[PDB]
Amino acid sequence: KSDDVNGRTKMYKNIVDGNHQMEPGMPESFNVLLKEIRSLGINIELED
Amino acid sequence: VSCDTDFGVCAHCYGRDLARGHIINKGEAIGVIAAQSIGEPGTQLTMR
Amino acid sequence: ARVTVQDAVEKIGNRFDLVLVAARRARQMQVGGKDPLVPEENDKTTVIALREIEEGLINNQILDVRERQEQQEQ
Amino acid sequence: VTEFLKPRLVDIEQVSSTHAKVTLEPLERGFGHTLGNALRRILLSSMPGCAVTEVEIDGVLHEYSTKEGVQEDILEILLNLKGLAVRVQGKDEVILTLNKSGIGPVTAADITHDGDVEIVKPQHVICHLTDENASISMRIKVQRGRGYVPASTRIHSEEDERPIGRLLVDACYSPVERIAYNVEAARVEQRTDLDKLVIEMETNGTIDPEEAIRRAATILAEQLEAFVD
Amino acid sequence: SVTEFLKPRLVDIEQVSSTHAKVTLEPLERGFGHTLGNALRRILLSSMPGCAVTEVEIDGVLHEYSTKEGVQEDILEILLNLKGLAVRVQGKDEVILTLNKSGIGPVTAADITHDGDVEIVKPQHVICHLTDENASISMRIKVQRGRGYVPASTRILVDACYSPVERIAYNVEAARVEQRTDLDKLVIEMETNGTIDPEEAIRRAATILAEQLEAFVDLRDVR
Amino acid sequence: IVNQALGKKAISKMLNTCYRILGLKPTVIFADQIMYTGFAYAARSGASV
Amino acid sequence: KPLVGTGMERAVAVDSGVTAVAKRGGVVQYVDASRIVIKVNEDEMYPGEAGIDIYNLTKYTRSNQNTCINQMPCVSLGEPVERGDVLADGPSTDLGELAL
Amino acid sequence: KAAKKMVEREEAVVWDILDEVIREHPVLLNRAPTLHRLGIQAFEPVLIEGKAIQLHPLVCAAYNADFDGDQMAVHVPLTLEAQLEARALMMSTNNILSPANGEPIIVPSQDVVLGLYYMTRDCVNAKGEGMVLTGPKEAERLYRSGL
Amino acid sequence: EIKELLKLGDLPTSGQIRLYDGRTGEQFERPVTVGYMYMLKLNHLVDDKM
Amino acid sequence: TRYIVNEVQDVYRLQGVKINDKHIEVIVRQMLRKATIVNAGSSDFLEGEQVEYSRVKIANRELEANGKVGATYSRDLLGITKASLATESFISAASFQETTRVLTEAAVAGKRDELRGLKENVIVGRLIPAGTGYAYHQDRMRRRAAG
């Protein structure tokens, strides 16, 4: 139910097909935070 | 503090203190369980 | 519906693995390919799975055994 | 069964036009209270009555305005028309019209009377006018029903019909609206003491006491017939 | 519509024992479920014909503070046990019964003398507690015909349990037929002392009220 | 336990006994039926002021 | 109207300026659900005027709280009216009394 | 689109499908001002023709409400696992005791305790003092007459 | 003063009056004090909250 | 610990509140961290190391290779508003009191979070290592050893 744009559609399909399966992905607000942090003189990234 | 684990708190020094009848199990977050019951009775007094 | 979930807790004990076992049973039950071992009473898959784990006929162990069974039977 | 001695309907009294008292024959112990309870609740719950469902008038369009020459609003018109009491003959869905001009008070008497419609209280107020040139022209339809209904219930029944100018109100379909009972030990002799019950009630004059009591008893028997088998 | 009322068709009854039964109905009309439940309850409790023991005349002192004299059990609880007996009488009126047994100790309903119309639902019922020796005793009990319930304080000696019932209760639930949910669902729960089927008991109560109220309509619904 | 003036602490310790002795579902259904009795008898009692 | 009050509700009703009151009136001629005319007597009449006063009521007027203000007149017809007395009844007012 | 139109039109079959699906689907409730773990609990939804949720009197102490003007937060877990997590841990039937001290949160009071304390009483002796019975007959004679 | 007023309209001075049940019709013990109160409706209406 | 628990239970008891002391001990333990050292002990010639990291280091250094190099420590308690900021992960302990200084300090030091705090999994939006997701977190940690 969050800003995960690629998750709301897929959960809706899983419901209408009665799958009831969820894949988290990543909230978009976290990407918002990363983009606004990189707006200043601070590097930030996520390793593997 | 008596328990020597260097990480969290072992169940062998906490008992239950819950609506169950058995010792606390692994993975249960006592810290979240704690720190909230203490201030919940916010019926204290101010102005001495 | 079920009022109290305690028999499954006693069959499991840890209180954390029972949810995982029942969820992994219900997922395969709803996707299909299996049959309910306990006679249903017009109820959803989750309640049937939890009554099955409460009855003591399914756990985190025999699922692995039967799954390796069809995996090697292919 | 040991001589249950069913009671009978005797001594029907008429206190007034809208108030009466009914007496019943003595019956065995432990019966009067429960039968009074059942008859009272049935008589107050489900019993057919005739009321006003909607009023249409050519003068005004809607109910939230006024008219030239009138004192009270269309709202008081509708509320008092809710308080009017009439009874109808066999066929239902009866439409009547009311036309009048002048400055004098308007009552239920000066309405076009048809053979299937009769007024019980001709002294009701229909929110008298004030202007000489003022003339009211509305036609009303009265139907019969059994329980209370609001205005929103009958909305889906009318989708393409009900044009502008036709205004709907709420119906009571309850012409008694008050009843009480009391049981006493009397009218018994040459036998073990029995109890008799007196029913005190007030209606609006639309329905006779014996008819309502008989209808209550009939529907009680009908609903209890299923428990026989 | 104008005068049409729904009638209960779902009359399913599930029972735990021969004396305990659960009766459930379909959604009934508004406000009538509880009327009917209260009426049926009061009919079942206030007046129900049946056969029951009225009083006993034991050998000894008529006073309640009697002696054990080998019975080792007070007469009060003996009378209480006697009240827990469902005696069925076919056609005859009030009759005298008596019993006599050796000193084995288990005193059952079979100890009573067997009559033509005197029947007991279950003969294993306790009448007296285990005796201490071979001493016997004469009961001299009698039953009467009656309906409902009256105490022995006013109408004499133990009690008058003419109602063949143990417990009666009811509940009302809301439900829906097609769209509207303002419907009443009546549930009847009642425990039987014996000798009468629960569904037979409720049918008898309904017929009793119907034959108590039929002339109120003055012969209505002819055709 | 049921033979007392049966105050709030009485019913409290009654539920405590039912929980520790019988278990989860017995004490839950016990509390349910107790509260139903409470609504029924208070409505039957009157208890006017 | 409220059965049990304190009496100050009358003053509140006559001071909030919500209802319609009569100013220098002697008797009423015509009454309408939305319009009232008063015929001032010659005692309270000064020369140079017709000698009538008109009050246009407030019929179903939107309020700040999205409520409704509707004024309902008190006199019927041909009633002798004095000065400083209420004629219409505004929201939650009865016969010049705060009836909420 | 057919499903959307018929849902928007609110037919009886739509209500029947609602009832069939909601019948096995527990639901979670929350207080807006929340302090401890019991401010959020799960229940089985039941349809009632109204517009205010019916909350049980007992859990009122945990939710700390008072039946004055209040707003509840309602949440639906959709995945099968989340329904299961609600059923196993966040049900009221399981959360009898406090996680704070150990005393039962469910502390019946008000009309229930008043009535119970009332009917376990005796003025001096009511009607029919000396009667003896077995225990089920007490209510039998209380409802009708005799004592 | 209030008790003096009640006698004039043929009312009991205590204000307690016996009541019957509209569902089972059994007379209530503990005679009840019934009365007439001035209720007020507020804009805090459920038709806005849902 | 004894003084703190006694003082706090006096205040909670003068009113009527009953609470176990284990939560208070938890508060003290979370509050009692960040020992300071006076001897080098071959660990680090600085101040402000965690008690647990120091204990692990002395266990892995003394018994294994060189027990003679002892690192004496003084366990100094810190207030909540300050000890909360004492976290190894920059993301956590940031929204609590202040963000800009924490961000500057992390960029200056060049620290990595590893996403070990619960708030880290909250903000990233994955299963927190507690309750039901504890087993999944443990499995992830186990597979991280091999690759």
Curated annotation (Swiss-Prot), chain A:
<comment type="function">
    <text>Resistance to the antibiotics salinamide A, salinamide B, rifampicin, streptolydigin, CBR703, myxopyronin, and lipiarmycin can result from mutations in this protein.</text>
</comment>
<comment type="subunit">
    <text>(Microbial infection) Interacts (via flap domain) with Escherichia phage lambda antitermination protein Q; this interaction renders bacterial RNAP resistant to transcription pausing and allows it to read through termination signals.</text>
</comment>
<comment type="subunit">
    <text>The RNAP catalytic core consists of 2 alpha, 1 beta, 1 beta' and 1 omega subunit. When a sigma factor is associated with the core the holoenzyme is formed, which can initiate transcription. The rRNA transcription and antitermination complex (rrnTAC) consists of RNAP, NusA, NusB, NusE (rpsJ), NusG, SubB, ribosomal protein S4, DNA and precursor rRNA; S4 is more flexible than other subunits. In pull-down experiments interacts with CedA.</text>
</comment>
<comment type="similarity">
    <text>Belongs to the RNA polymerase beta chain family.</text>
</comment>
<protein>
    <recommendedName>
        <fullName>DNA-directed RNA polymerase subunit beta</fullName>
    </recommendedName>
</protein>
<comment type="function">
    <text>DNA-dependent RNA polymerase (RNAP) catalyzes the transcription of DNA into RNA using the four ribonucleoside triphosphates as substrates.</text>
</comment>
UniProtKB/Swiss-Prot annotation, chain C:
<keyword id="KW-0240">DNA-directed RNA polymerase</keyword>
<dbReference type="GO" id="GO:0005829">
    <property type="term" value="C:cytosol"/>
</dbReference>
<dbReference type="GO" id="GO:0003899">
    <property type="term" value="F:DNA-directed RNA polymerase activity"/>
</dbReference>
<dbReference type="GO" id="GO:0048870">
    <property type="term" value="P:cell motility"/>
</dbReference>
<keyword id="KW-0804">Transcription</keyword>
<dbReference type="GO" id="GO:0031564">
    <property type="term" value="P:transcription antitermination"/>
</dbReference>
<dbReference type="GO" id="GO:0090605">
    <property type="term" value="P:submerged biofilm formation"/>
</dbReference>
<dbReference type="GO" id="GO:0030880">
    <property type="term" value="C:RNA polymerase complex"/>
</dbReference>
<dbReference type="GO" id="GO:0006879">
    <property type="term" value="P:intracellular iron ion homeostasis"/>
</dbReference>
<dbReference type="GO" id="GO:2000142">
    <property type="term" value="P:regulation of DNA-templated transcription initiation"/>
</dbReference>
<keyword id="KW-0548">Nucleotidyltransferase</keyword>
<comment type="function">
    <text>Part of the processive rRNA transcription and antitermination complex (rrnTAC). The complex forms an RNA-chaperone ring around the RNA exit tunnel of RNAP. It supports rapid transcription and antitermination of rRNA operons, cotranscriptional rRNA folding, and annealing of distal rRNA regions to allow correct ribosome biogenesis.</text>
</comment>
Swiss-Prot record, chain D:
<dbReference type="GO" id="GO:0042128">
    <property type="term" value="P:nitrate assimilation"/>
</dbReference>
<dbReference type="GO" id="GO:0003899">
    <property type="term" value="F:DNA-directed RNA polymerase activity"/>
</dbReference>
<dbReference type="GO" id="GO:0071973">
    <property type="term" value="P:bacterial-type flagellum-dependent cell motility"/>
</dbReference>
<dbReference type="GO" id="GO:0036460">
    <property type="term" value="P:cellular response to cell envelope stress"/>
</dbReference>
<dbReference type="GO" id="GO:0044780">
    <property type="term" value="P:bacterial-type flagellum assembly"/>
</dbReference>
<dbReference type="GO" id="GO:0005737">
    <property type="term" value="C:cytoplasm"/>
</dbReference>
<keyword id="KW-0548">Nucleotidyltransferase</keyword>
<dbReference type="GO" id="GO:0006352">
    <property type="term" value="P:DNA-templated transcription initiation"/>
</dbReference>
<feature type="region of interest" description="Alpha N-terminal domain (alpha-NTD)">
    <location>
        <begin position="1"/>
        <end position="229"/>
    </location>
</feature>
<dbReference type="GO" id="GO:0009408">
    <property type="term" value="P:response to heat"/>
</dbReference>
<dbReference type="GO" id="GO:2000142">
    <property type="term" value="P:regulation of DNA-templated transcription initiation"/>
</dbReference>
<dbReference type="GO" id="GO:0031564">
    <property type="term" value="P:transcription antitermination"/>
</dbReference>
UniProtKB/Swiss-Prot annotation, chain E:
<keyword id="KW-0007">Acetylation</keyword>
<dbReference type="GO" id="GO:0032784">
    <property type="term" value="P:regulation of DNA-templated transcription elongation"/>
</dbReference>
<dbReference type="GO" id="GO:0009408">
    <property type="term" value="P:response to heat"/>
</dbReference>
<keyword id="KW-0804">Transcription</keyword>
<dbReference type="GO" id="GO:0003677">
    <property type="term" value="F:DNA binding"/>
</dbReference>
<dbReference type="GO" id="GO:0016020">
    <property type="term" value="C:membrane"/>
</dbReference>
<dbReference type="GO" id="GO:2000142">
    <property type="term" value="P:regulation of DNA-templated transcription initiation"/>
</dbReference>
<dbReference type="GO" id="GO:0003899">
    <property type="term" value="F:DNA-directed RNA polymerase activity"/>
</dbReference>
<feature type="region of interest" description="Alpha N-terminal domain (alpha-NTD)">
    <location>
        <begin position="1"/>
        <end position="220"/>
    </location>
</feature>
<keyword id="KW-0808">Transferase</keyword>
<dbReference type="GO" id="GO:0006879">
    <property type="term" value="P:intracellular iron ion homeostasis"/>
</dbReference>
<dbReference type="GO" id="GO:0005737">
    <property type="term" value="C:cytoplasm"/>
</dbReference>
